[model samples]
Target: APAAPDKPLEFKGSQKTVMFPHAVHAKVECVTCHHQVDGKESFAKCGSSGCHDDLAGKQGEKSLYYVVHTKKELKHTNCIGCHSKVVEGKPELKKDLTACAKSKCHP
Candidate 1:
């Protein structure tokens, strides 16, 4: 596996700025989030054109919100959804990982 990023990536949101710990999630396969298309794995930015660039469109699958906020009920593919699963059996990790308002991502 390739080396993870040394610095956290930042995302600005309506509620707060989210700092994604890339190194922290390095255990996961890159393809898990950076999916492939037409049998080729794409390394393009998530918000690039034709990707999840619908920053203002709230209803589509391509919406930026859907990219990271999609719920686990539908599929555990997004950050929040995946984190929800990561904290399932580990109650102690919920506060730092899945606590939304007070999460480390927001802190």
Candidate 2:
């Protein structure tokens, strides 16, 4: 298995860049975020072909925004989905984890 990055990883976005603490999420299983491709599990960039490559697409399944910010009700493959779930269990993380403008994700 590949190792998690010790430093934060940055995702440049149209609205605001995301500073992802890869180390912070090291405890999570890789499969949690890295979805299957061609019906087989594999490690690949989210923006890689056949995945969330449609950065400007309106559809949630392929859009870059959807890859990181999809609602939990719709899907839990994105960062927002997992963060929102965590906030539900740990209310203290509500602002930092899920707040649109006030979130640590954007800062």
Candidate 3:
């Protein structure tokens, strides 16, 4: 049988709306970031990483709390990386968000 279509993914940002092409990503597999979730397919909690680790309470302090306030590496890593790859070989449609956000996209 054929695979099912991926559900539309959207994010409501504090300043702007964001949407993800879920069907395109579904082909890539969710394991890229969620490799260890045994047998079940579902949205893994961002905090589950360390909490589910065998070390558990023994682990050191590391948190996604920063994601709530900072927009540096986190934004660039996800946004710029995707835009660069998706727009590669299509210079006219390509945009460098890293630079464009601070400058002009046309010039």
Q: Per-residue lDDT of 2-57 in model 3, one digit per residue for the tens?
A: 34336754443323334444565565655443434356554654445553332223
Model 3 segments beyond 4 Å from truth? 1-5, 33-42, 45-77, 95-107
Per-residue lDDT over 1-107 for candidate 1, one digit per residue giving the tens place of the 0 to 100 score: 44556897776544446777777776888888877777787777777788877776655677777667766354326787888888898879998876656778755
TM-score of each: 0.79, 0.81, 0.38
Poorest 10 consecutive residues of model 1 by lDDT? 69-78
Q: For model 1, what is the error of residue 23's alpha carbon versus the real structure, in angstroms, after optimal superposition?
A: 1.1
Best-to-worst order by TM-score is 2, 1, 3
lDDT of each: 0.72, 0.73, 0.41
- Compose the digit string of candidate 2's lDDT tens values, residues 33-84: 7766567777777777777787666457778876677674654466788888
lDDT of 2: 0.73
TM-score, predicted candidate 3 vs. hidden true structure: 0.38
Best candidate, lDDT-wise? 2
